[PDB]
Point group: D2
Chain length 124, copies 4
């Protein structure tokens, strides 16, 4: 993939969260996520997909990934999905939006899902 | 094994007739394929995701999510959909999701890059 | 306003909430919302906008409204916006997605905002 | 306490859209929005609500407003609702998440809604 080199590596969000990922040539994202916020301790497995043949009009590369917030330290009974685009060049960034869904009883389902945005850069 | 690995592993159908075949792994992995029924999509695309392999036993649903990049060997729509939701098991087993579809865009068009919606998957055709 | 009549009146969500609205010829939505879930006691003011000259190809009518969850009896320090479209006809619906934002500290901002959907109908489910 | 004066005024988002708004004592927001992107020309009416009695623990003031993209110059068959919170003081700002829905056929309904986020400050941007 074209941005397999630019994607693979270590990324930091605005809050201090760290994302390490390897971009496969087929389009896989594999890695670990470590949150600066929430009911999270240490690293959690991340799996994802990216467009491995983007357009060539200076358009970004579409990707997305999931982290379920269970590891050998803790279980928040929740999962976050990040949807977004990788932009490369001088100040590469992954700009995302996300949905964090918690497992709830039916009664509480209406309030199961938070939404937000995250920008990741190669430096922080 | 995961508590809902057997419940989750299988074929799922949403309200639009899109179909998703997933294997739940013991660790929390979800792997499989998605066939969309709407938009710039043709045949099967790879899906990868994660689920809570040890959910609450208070009768809460099981948190999960998965991602489809809309490239396969026949088409590329330059976009990706992430589904975030939860699995409820039983006779009327379902997966309730909210989703995000991001297209690759220029910076001028970034502001309108991401669609939002909701899908409900059941084990039967709608 | 084309769907001014079809929009005006009482609507119900699948969760037993009710919304009463008057659609003005100007594209105003005015009315009140009465909850069935959340820190929500009784009636709350609603204000919003609708497209008063829709397309004529069988497309819906875009609209949105806000409720700040403060009335004379309770205050949840939060607000919901509903963005959606009105579809009229035999089985008239208003299909929405919404954002519920709570007032927070900067520390807790990242989890200020919940997201969901609701479908409103003219008949009480 | 009441941020009527704080909220009331001229705001600009990161893309140079302008938002003139008057907060009322009853929790009303009224004014105009002029966009810098999309099918928009000049000013559109906005109406909304804010919490007229917010917490006193450093919390922001929850708010929300709507613009239907119809005026005497253009009709884009859509509406945007912003949901967010006002924070006063230095770097007084309104942080929002937004949903933009267009009227569609039932066939195109799955992709009727865009999502994003906007931050408004009183300083017009670059
Ligand atoms: O605690 C967790 C699980 C880990 C949170 C990580 C999130 S994912 C989006 C954002 N971006 C980051 O980097 N970190 C945060 N969830 C949860 C559920 C319900 C209420 C609350 S307060 C917290
Ligand atoms: O065409 C595609 C890619 C495949 C769409 C499948 C979606 S994913 C969420 C939802 N759930 C399903 O089962 N199907 C739909 N994207 C795209 C981008 C920009 C404008 C438009 S119209 C379409
Ligand atoms: O729940 C409320 C106030 C009542 C709204 C309930 C929602 S608004 C969208 C949807 N449509 C309905 O009719 N009901 C639901 N506030 C609140 C604030 C902070 C945290 C939490 S959990 C709850
Ligand atoms: O073009 C418009 C009307 C103006 C949208 C401006 C947006 S509202 C959220 C964000 N915040 C701003 O300040 N600007 C942007 N609607 C429309 C309809 C159908 C398809 C598409 S792509 C766009």
């Amino acid at each position: 993939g074209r941005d397999q080199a630019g994607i693979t590596g270590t990324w930091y969000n605005q809050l201090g969260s760290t994302f390490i990922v390897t971009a496969g040539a087929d389009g896989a994202l594999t890695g670990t996520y470590e949150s600066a916020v929430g009911n999270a301790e240490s690293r959690y497995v991340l799996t994802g997909r990216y467009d491995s043949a983007p357009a060539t009009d200076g358009s970004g590369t579409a990707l997305g990934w999931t982290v379920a917030w269970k590891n050998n330290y803790r279980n928040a009974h929740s999962a976050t999905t990040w949807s977004g685009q990788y932009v490369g060049g001088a100040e590469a960034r992954i700009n995302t939006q996300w949905l964090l869904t918690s497992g709830t009883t039916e009664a509480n389902a209406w309030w199961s899902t938070l939404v937000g945005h995250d920008t990741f850069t190669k430096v922080k």
